[PDB]
Symmetry: C2
Subunit: 383 residues, 2 copies
């Protein structure tokens, strides 16, 4: 009577959404220091400007516009009490941004909403009871019986996480269709620049708002449903020597990231084992024969990953595309990358959804120094 | 395909529990509580709290935040003063530590090497941190750094039922997988001075206590070496009709506050029959009194309403009330304590199954969104 699915969990649709208001990175330091009332801190502003100009970012999207920010002035200070107003905005907007991306994902998938059986929802911005997962269930009018997995305060590796979570949901339940969600806003982290914490200058320069939604299921219906990628393996690891490397603390002033180690370095030195464990399911191809969906944590980390593995510059283009066009959207970013990977393959008429490569890796990293990896099989395009 | 599934139903192989050391007798609590919060002059308020305590079905609760902790963090002893940061500091450190104690007991009952744990599921409602309590627990126990972790923050009173659902698919879809299934709760995020303006906090203050429980769940248990306690055959949940905003839990600069806006005891056992009837289909739809029952001990009244609605024998909800009596409402952990108490009562009485003689049973959690969570369990023959 309990029946399992037959095949691997398959990505059947990918939808995305951002807040409407776009911010050009070149104009951002001006905007930022003006609205936070810190433009008199000349040498701080020259540091942010150089971080911005080297971020590999062209455009970011923010729900919290100048009107929203001036209506909540505590968010425009450095560390004055502000949690309550950041919470009010995030609890309301995080599931609504998800709804928009979901609408698109549900449309591409093309099946009735009542065949969605599970919901997985990850976010790093705000926490509430009931969760964003339940609210999203109401907004979309999903079946009241959906089995929900709500992942609060998940972190930048959250996009890889929901793939791992959805994998087992899809594979262990015949006919299960999983609405797989990551929705991130910067309203819990946004704050005035300050000398006492120069690592916030990076976060302020790279983080933007975004959400992505997938439909994942095993045993896709031929002709009716359209496979994009198959998840063949998910795993994670806690990196060696990485205790306290990134701390994320939710305080009365909102969410603050405290760093105490070499993270760009730590990541490039220690991902070789889990990477090697992962690709084994793929018959261990070489690094340049894999397609790559890496969390665009920063242009520098990407640069380090490429040098460590001697990647051809073409390998991380889909990843850099997202970084360029959207910035670092925390957990959602790598799911945007996955969308971009299939789109690039459509534009170029590649032989697979992995721009011609047969296998690829989805890679997230974040607190604890957690590295999350899924191994994906690309789907033949017919071109 | 090449990925290897397990063959049989997810099975509970061990159940451990832990509480803070300091016990608080319910009969003495209003004196303690109104003194420590400096509200002992609010005579009729204290009289109202006292009557709730004496009727709560609760004898003892455990708290990590003792007098010393509370007087060293005085903001927590007010009503709505800024206090989140110090509640966070306490919860972030103690929640994974309390879980470790319950884990040590579950791991010893299970008796297998720690490196054979493949997954960790961790739920809590008290405090949030990056990295999560799941990672910290992993380090403390010295688990494999490659454990597949599912961290469920801000989960709510149905969190105990949730982790069963979450571990079920992990265990069943992965051959040899062993799931360390954890719920850990402290009340330090909710504790605050009683006040007239919010009388519903007077209830939480009378019933919420501290606790953690930890299970080992796996499919395909090894004969003789591992000892099955219960099989999970079906997990599901539903959002109750017209139950929008019945219980809101808000995390603020003053910590965690709940806001009720409906009759939840009534709403709950009035709307539970559809998921209940669908649930028991897997068990061959036995009658309610032929099922064993592990219900989240939300309050003595909700338990009473469940018994009247379904016309249960007084004996049915005894394991549940045992937990409410000895431990209070420990939010998500409570129903896992109950699950443990059920196999214990069955051992003590020499029952034929780990369900006090019943073949099938229900684990029931309920909470915010007005979510009802249900797993259907098969008990195991004891050999008695």
């Amino acid at each position: 009577k309990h029946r399992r699915a037959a095949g691997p969990a398959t990505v059947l649709a990918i939808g995305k959404a951002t807040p409407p208001t776009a911010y050009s990175q070149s104009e951002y330091p001006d905007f930022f220091f003006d609205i936070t009332n810190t433009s008199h801190k000349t040498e701080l502003k020259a540091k942010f400007a150089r971080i911005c100009k080297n971020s590999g970012i062209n455009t970011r999207y923010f729900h919290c516009t100048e009107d929203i920010l001036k209506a909540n002035p505590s968010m425009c200070t450095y560390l004055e009490p502000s949690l309550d107003v950041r919470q009010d905005i995030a609890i309301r907007e995080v599931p609504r941004l998800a709804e928009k991306a979901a609408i698109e994902a549900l449309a591409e998938w093309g099946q009735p909403r009542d065949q969605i059986t599970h919901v997985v929802f990850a976010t790093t911005s705000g926490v509430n009871m009931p969760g964003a997962d339940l609210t999203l269930t109401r907004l979309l009018g999903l079946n009241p019986n959906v089995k929900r997995t709500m992942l609060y305060q998940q972190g930048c590796f959250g996009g890889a996480t929901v793939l791992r979570v959805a994998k087992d949901l899809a594979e262990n339940n015949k006919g299960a269709r999983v609405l797989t969600v990551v929705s991130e806003l910067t309203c819990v982290t946004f704050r005035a620049p300050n000398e006492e914490h120069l690592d916030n200058l990076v976060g302020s320069a790279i983080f933007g708002d975004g959400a992505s939604v997938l439909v994942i299921g095993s045993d896709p219906i031929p002709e009716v449903e359209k496979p994009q990628f198959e998840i063949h393996w998910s795993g994670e690891t806690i990196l060696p020597e990485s205790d306290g490397a990134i701390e994320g603390r939710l305080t009365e002033a909102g969410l603050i990231f405290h760093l105490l180690k070499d993270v760009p370095g730590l990541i490039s030195r220690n991902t070789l084992p889990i990477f090697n464990k992962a690709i084994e399911v793929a018959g261990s191809p070489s690094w340049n024969d894999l397609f790559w969906c890496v969390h665009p944590g920063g242009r520098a980390i990407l640069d380090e990953v490429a040098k460590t593995l001697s990647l051809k510059p073409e390998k991380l283009e889909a990843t850099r595309d997202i970084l360029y066009n959207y910035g670092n959207m925390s957990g959602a970013s790598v799911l945007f990358v996955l969308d971009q990977m299939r789109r690039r393959s459509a534009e170029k008429k590649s032989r697979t959804t992995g721009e011609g490569c047969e296998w690829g890796l989805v890679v997230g990293f974040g607190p604890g120094l957690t590295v999350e990896v899924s191994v994906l099989r690309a789907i033949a395009t017919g071109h």
